[PDB]
Amino acid sequence: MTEYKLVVVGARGVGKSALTIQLIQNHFVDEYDPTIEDSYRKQVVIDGETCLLDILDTAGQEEYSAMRDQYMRTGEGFLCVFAINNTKSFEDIHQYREQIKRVKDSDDVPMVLVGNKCDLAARTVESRQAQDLARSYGIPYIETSAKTRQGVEDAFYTLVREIRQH
Template structure:
């Protein structure tokens, strides 16, 4: 099983190599190239890794490659697995799919059968990953063989819409869209990871906000209870005092009107 480690690519802007900061960990992405036999999966991968076209067909069982590149000014280490297209390796392919983060789903534009069997590969990916949110780029390879084409560009676009994924045609022989296919797949993985991070952060913020609101509500209820109790006591006290005063005044007025005029203090006994 060949393992190829390609040198770091250079910055096309200033022609200086991308040096990794010692304190910065380079993000690694696990890419899996999937498709039928003879569609050019290995040719695509080697063209991307070595800028070299392999025109001999040698059925792949499993080849692994690594390459460090800069995508959108961010250095990435790509771990690329080129899988077997033959049906007898289906179980082995599933094992690779479990570890893959993103998938290049490849067919040949000159082989209708390779296009028709894509749904099988697609469903296998979703089943193994147990989700329909999987970064996938649909690739129609051998686009340079225009006279032999049997699958139109429009058919590829339509299938990509069904798969809810990106689509492009490539030519491993001429190097057309080869880099873009791998780079776009990394971008899709990054977008998914960012979406997951944002969702988690949003949920944490929402939970924290709800906890704070609950705490403030409890504090407000406790304060309101104390204030209400004091006011009630004061109001009740004032009310009692006022009522008692009025009753006293009425009692005095009644006793004054009913009591006979006398110079003696025995008037109190008359009241009783």
């Protein structure tokens, strides 16, 4: 069966891991637990197609430097996550989209911008902003909450449909 290699990337603390365990295991991890690397394989059905989700959950920042090049070379689609109450992580999005284009040797790579933690009142990143950014890349923008589970299947399934269309 068709597998889709996907990698979840973005800055630390934005909820990369909370989105992935809400999808795989259906529950909210409200813990403090920084990732080095976690990989997850889940056999799923999407738009009637049998497929395997081979997800790679990554570390926000650290001595993952050019050392990101390796997963970025092999992931077919990317979730670029920032958090809606963290302006720095939204500004850091640029840096990841450029390194991904730099290793994949292309200007169109399957991607979706994910504005996580949409359940929190007190956001510092408005959606106009994050929509126009998504618009400038020709990339989808979707808001999520790993707490409510609002938007999480939609962000992962949209990205599969982006790999499917490339």
